[PDB]
Structures are given as structure tokens and as C-alpha cells.
């Protein structure tokens, strides 16, 4: 009976999102296969069906604009978590998003966002460091291709993160080969080929009936049955009722079903949220129906008009310009070897009983402005900001959902003492241990160092990229150097700070000299004992 | 029966990729042989089929624009490997990618990426230093020509690296002569001519059933049979079960088969991955079908329109402009020697019983904008960024796959103490020994120096080339020299650092003087004992 409930929910979601999925699939097929939909091939008579598109330049420009305004993910430390743990999570997320597989997933999701309207990349977990001694795991992102048709979000949820959604499938259209490999890979090779991955979020909601006493109110009456266990204590306490806080606890469950046969895996736990994170284009609710778009429908209509115009011109062209004449069979009764085009004779002969020709088509020459209007419509209705704010905000919201999912999975995996790599800002690689059980020297307590496990909320700061920040800083410092009298310690400090803001391999010695001069000057704090020795040597000099 | 399984897999892959291979072959044939496909030769009547193409200028611009933004491959050192081994692999990959054969392979792959959509160059290994004393091997890259039709990737893999692909053939369409040479070269001259190279990746997957004790959990129950060997120990241990880490181990296998006759070689090992690395153009999944494109389909339609327009013009031109008249045979009964064009007579005679002419075609003069629209479409729909980001990103991803394959092969061949050449950055060539078994002086341990063998993952940094970095550095230093008061040690340091950033042979003497002054100043660290003597001479002076 369980599979009947699963398929009822899946069919409800499918039929509810059918219209949006149809239009998105048509958009994707238009932007990747052929501009000439079947409707258009019915309403037309043109014989040279061509595709002189200007959509892909627009999509490329939009993707490039997004790529040039990178989005970072931060972490607010909550419930008294130390800022250093927040920094460690920021670094681990940065190094798990700079990994090339994650870049491929994000790029595919963005491209299908801009073209179709939905991209929906996915999170997944797997082991590293292949050896049975440990059980270390990492986080990589497998993209979901054509996510407008292979991901069926819960129709009921009404948030763009799809946070409220309590289930979302991932259809896989497998043939025989896909069948046996994706069957032997995980569960069993039991034959029944469209398989599914029905994610699920199960929750436990109660009342918890907080009660108050002279002392601070501890959790009492956690259930309704505990109330019936304290029928006397509820009346013997100082206060009878204060609040009805409905405590909630949730865990994500994953099941692999099939349409015909029974489900293959009943329930499995992986993380806390459903890993699939969707991106959407211009997304909103119209008459209580989810509708999402891209930058391909509008350019699609314009592009169909342009294709029609250019195909019409090509249809005019591909006719031999030589005139075809009209005359009676007895008008050339004998003289038929003259009119073949295989020879050119001085004069043309016609017997007893002057002729009319077949009118070739003429180019309207009014199609100049027509074509220009269509092409300009495609090239401006789509784009032109400095980045399409709606698409950038949508990507930011989806990346924040990705941050929440990644943080929860990190919280639930990074438990065992581990060694991880952290990409601090400015690409500075670093190595950090997670637990670092070392006992303090002057304190006497245990004081585990990092202890990533906690509770965190994600918030993204879209805007000035770090390299752009540094370039603007260098420009400002150079301007000040232009507008400051020389010799004064302010000028020397500004020049030294400009030195320390330079680039890498070429001027490394200048940057190192600047650091030495700053530290021995006393403005920049030392960070290593050699710098401390330099500082004391300069001071005592 | 083995060959039947091989051919089943190969036929499945072939029929699954048939549509994409057909369209890519048509694209390549259009961009290298003749613009006039057979379809167009059916829908047309023009007699002068011409090719006034503007596709190849676009492809040339794109390839050059790639060439001006070179991609480097880096190496993250993992599992506690020293950074010096990482630097040695960095330089070794650089010197194996700067070799001319590798440049030919990469150039052919990129050219076929831009034209057709797939380039798929190939890794291969062979001996150097021909002498039986040793067995040293090197890595060179043999290009695969027309890779859209001679390489059939596994249909089931779903990554642009084709990393997931677990087999991939390489068809060779050989005639008799190719048959005997490619048969005697490796296996045997046993006659059966399309031969194949069926690469394969086999894996061993188990459960490994980690068990935990008071001490750290060592690898126990590596197999399921070892569990049945410890039926007592599993119950006598402190903990019964913690995790089920499915350890995996993979190794490549290569087999040379033929369609009709039996396979020639059953299995051979070469490296760890399948050497073939593909590049793709705009690549994505549409309705669960692999579709990849180039910059030739869109320009292809535009180019067909331009060809038709100019051929129409040329068909108008090639006619005698002399008018051909229409008149009865008895209208010139006697005077037939007048109308031949072989003479020019003063007057023209006509007997008893004024005439009509044959209308030559006229140039519509509306074709000006037609031709301009078609040509401009070809020249802008294709290109215009500063590099086509999708093509550059795909090349970067393929080069990262090349890095992984090269690193696996280097790890698996460079075991014996060898001597290699390293191309450090800025072309500074260097000779380095790999093992360098020298025992330490003040330590007392063995401490092999480089020991390339390890476990590295590749990551590419596409962007500013090193020469561009140096030119920008020189520009910045020159600007500071323009905006800094003279005499001060900062100005002198800037001038000397500008000196040390100059070019080669011409100004070597100033660069050497600058190094001497920097080292005697104490800013740049000495790198050789003569510089140390210079430093102490300057200091004690």
C-alpha cells in the first residue's frame, strides 16, 4: 500500500506541474535542438527551413555577466557558537564550491535556468581516501540535466527554495543498460524502464505543554501521555499553563521506486534536508499555478520571425534567374533544340503562330526594417543592471538553500576527528584539523578547538567580488599617493600598503619588503616569531 | 562469448550516439570539404554552385583567441605529500604539454571542437632512450582525427570528462595495407577492415564492514567471507557495527577487437584511467540524449544563404548581354548571314513579313541587404567575453581530465630512479632527479627527496597568462616610479625591481646588476654562495 501512496503523491505533483513542465521542455528544445517547432512547420509553406538564430549570443552574454559577479556564502554563528567555527565552515564551503565538479554543476544549473527556467543541481555524499581503516566522507554536487522535466517538486510547497516541499522525485529514463547498472549499483538486480528517487522529509509534531514553577521552567509534559503521567503534579505545581510550544523534529528519508513493480528501497536517511536545490528564472504564482520563465520565450518569438524572414529571402534566391517563357507546343513545333539552355544561339526562331514569361518572385525590399525589428527585438527584449537582477537574486536565493543543505550535511557528517582543507579568502589555501583534542596549557580544560557541529543560518552578500575590492582599494591608495605631500609617515604608510596589495610571483620580493617595513614600523602586527625578532631588533636599534 | 558482450556494448553505444555523430559528421564535412550539402543541391536549380565562405575566418579568430589565453594545470598535494613533489609534477606536466607533439594534439582537438563539437585527443606511453639497459618511459599525446566519428564514448556516462564512462572504443578504418601494418605492429598478422581498440575500466566493489574496538578501528572484515571467518570475534568485540564503507579499486584494460573475426588481444593494462580525453563544444542533455554543438551549424545556415545569393548573381552574369531576337524563319529567309555576331553590319534587313526580344534576367538590386544580412549573421552569430567562455571552460575541464590521466600514468610508471627535465614557470628549464636516494647529513634518515608517487588532484587556473602578469607588473611599477619622490630607498627599490623584470638577451647586464644591488641591499635573499660573498662584502664594508 505504501507504493500506492507514493505514486498518488507523485502523480498529483506531475499533473499539477504539467503545464509549466510542458512549456519549459518546449523552451529547452527550442534553445538546443531546432528553432522550428511543429506548430510553426504547420503554419508555413517555406521550403528552406533555416536557423539564423541570435538567442545563444544573448544567453552567453547573460551567463558571462553572472560569472563575473560571483556569489559568496557566509554563516551567522548561532546559539553561542564561536566565530572561529563560523570561519571554518565558510572556508570548507568555499573549498567545496571551488572544486571543479561543483563548478560544472553550478554552471549547468545556471545555463538551464537562463534557457529553460529551472536548473536544480543536487547535493550528494561519498567517501574519500579509499581505505577501510576510516569512514571519512566529503560533499560533491552532481548536476541534474534537463531539470525542468527530471525533477518533480512537491506541488503543494509555495517557497522558491522549495524549502516547504516534503518530497521531490528524480526520474531516470533508463534503457536496459541503465537498468542493470543502476540496479546492481545500489540495491538488487531484480527485474521489473523509468526508475525514481523519491526523497521525503518526515516530521514529528507534538504539543509539549510547557509548565512553569518558581525555578526556571524546565521541559515538562513533553508529550500528551506525560500529562496523564503527572495528573497530580500538574495541580501541585505553582502555575498550571503558560505556553503550548509545538516542538518539531525532522529527518530526510530517501526511497527508490518504480512505476509498475513494487518499490526497491523502503527508507534511508541521508542528511537532514532534501539535497536537491532548484534555481528558477522569473518565478511567480499566477492564478494559483506555479509559472517560471527564462530568457528564451520572448527571444523565441522574435527568432521565429527572423527565421521566417531569412528563409523567405533564401526561397526567393534559389531559382535560376533565367526567364521561363510561355508558348504553345506548335509555336516551336520543330524548333525544340533551341530552347534548352544547353546552347546559346544568335537568334531565336518561332514558326507561324511574341510570347509571355513566368514571373519570378521579387524581394520586397521592405524586409530590411522587418528583419531589423525582429533581430533588434531578440537582442534587446532579452537583455538591456550590470547583471540581470532577477536572475542574480534567484541564483543567490538558490545558493543560500545550497548553503543550508551543505551546512546540515556537514553538521551530520563531520563528527569523527578529521583533517580538512580550508580555502580562506583570497585563494589562500590552508590545512586545519577539525576536532584538535589538544588540552590547554595555561587553562587546564579540554577545549576542543573548532568543533564544527552546531547550528548556523546562511546569508549571502552578492556584490563586489574580492578581486574587484582589491583593485578598487589599489585605485584609492594610488589616488591618495597622488594627493599627499611626500616624506611624511602617511605617504610612506600609503606606499607600503600599495606594495602589499600587489599581485603574486612577479613582485613577491617587494611585498615581502613592504611587510618587513610595516612590521618594523609598528603599524602592522607581527604574525610569526621571525617578524617578532625583526620588530624587537628595529625597536631596540 | 566475450566478443559478443564487447560487440553488444559497442553497438549499444553506437546506436545511442548515432544522431549526434551524424550531425557532427555533417558539420565537419561542411566545414572542410564543400558548403553545398546534398539536401541543398536538391532544393536549388542554380548552375554555378560557389563557396564564398566566411566561416573559416570566424573559426580562425576563435582558435587564435583561445591561443592567447593559455590554460595551466596545477596539482593539489593530498594525504600529506610534500609541496616540493607537487611542484615537480607541476613542472613535469608543463614540460610534457610544451612538447611539440602535445601542442599538435591539443591544436587538432581544439580545432575540431570549434568546428564539429568534439576533439578527443589521446594519451599514450612509449619508451625513450633506446637501450636495453633500462626501461624508462615517457608520455606523449597522439591526436584522434575526426573524433566525432572515430571515438564512441560509453552511452551511459553523464559527465563532460567522460569520467564515468567505463569503456570507449577507437575505430580504425584500415585498408589492406593498414591491416597488415597495424596487425604486425602489435599482436599478429592473422587475417580476418575496421579494427577497434576497446578500452575498459573494471572495478572491485565490496562491503568491508568496518568494526570498532577500544583502540582505533583497524580495517576488519574486508570481505563478506572474513565475517564468516570471525563469527566469534564479531560478538566478542566491544562494538558490533559502525559503518559499511564500500571500498573500491579500479584498473584499466585495453583490448583490440574486430567486427567479424575473434578479438586479437584479451586484456592489457595501461595506466589507471582510460587515456582518451574528449573536448566538447556547447554540450548538454536534451530529452536524455547527448547533444553537442560547435560554431559551425549557425554559420552553416547563414553561409548557405550567402552562397545561394552570390551564385544567383553569378548565374545572372554569365550570359551574353547581346539581345536574342524572336522572329519567323521566313522573316529572314534569305538574310541569315546577317544575324550571327561574326560580323557587324551597318543596317539590318528584314523581308516582307518589327520583332521581339528574349528578356535576359535582371539583378534585383534588393540583394544588397540580403547578402549583407546573411554575411553579418554568419560573422556575428558565431562570435561577438575576451574568450568564448563556454568553449574555454569546456577546454579547461577537458585539460583537467588530461591532468588526472597524466598524473595517474606518472604515478604508475615513474617508479625506477629516473632523471627528468622540469620546465618551471617562466620557461626556466631545470634538470632534476626523481628519487635522489642521497642520505641526509645532519638528520640521519634516508629521506628520498622528490618521490613523485602519491595521490594528487588537478585544478586549473584559467586567466592571466604569466607573460601578461609580468607586463601588468611592469606597468604598475613604472606607474609608481612616475608617482614617487626620488632618492628615497623606495624609489631605488622600485627601479631595481623594474630592472629585474625586463626581457632576456638584450638587457641581461642590467638585470644582473639589479640582482647584485638587491642582494647587497638585503632585500632579495641570496641564492648562491657568490651572492652570499657579495652580501657579506657589502655589509662589512
Numbering used by the authors:
A (entry chain I), B (entry chain J): 6 to 197, 217 to 377, 388 to 418, 443 to 599
What did the article's authors report about this structure?
Tailed double-stranded DNA (dsDNA) bacteriophages and their eukaryotic counterparts, such as herpesviruses, possess a dodecameric portal at a unique vertex of the capsid; this portal serves as a channel for DNA packaging during viral assembly and delivery. The P22 procapsid consists of an icosahedral coat comprising 415 coat protein (gene product [gp] 5) subunits, a dodecameric ring comprising portal protein (gp1) subunits located at a unique capsid vertex, and an internal core comprising approximately 250–300 SP (gp8) subunits and 3 ejection proteins. In this study, we present the structure of the SP gp8 in complex with the dodecameric portal in the P22 procapsid at subnanometer resolution.
Local reconstruction with C12 symmetry improved the resolution to 3.0 Å. The portal protein gp1 comprises five domains: the clip (residues 344–398), stem (residues 320–343 and 399–416), wing (residues 6–319 and 417–524), and crown (residues 525–600). The C-terminal helical barrel domain (residues 601–725) appeared unstructured.
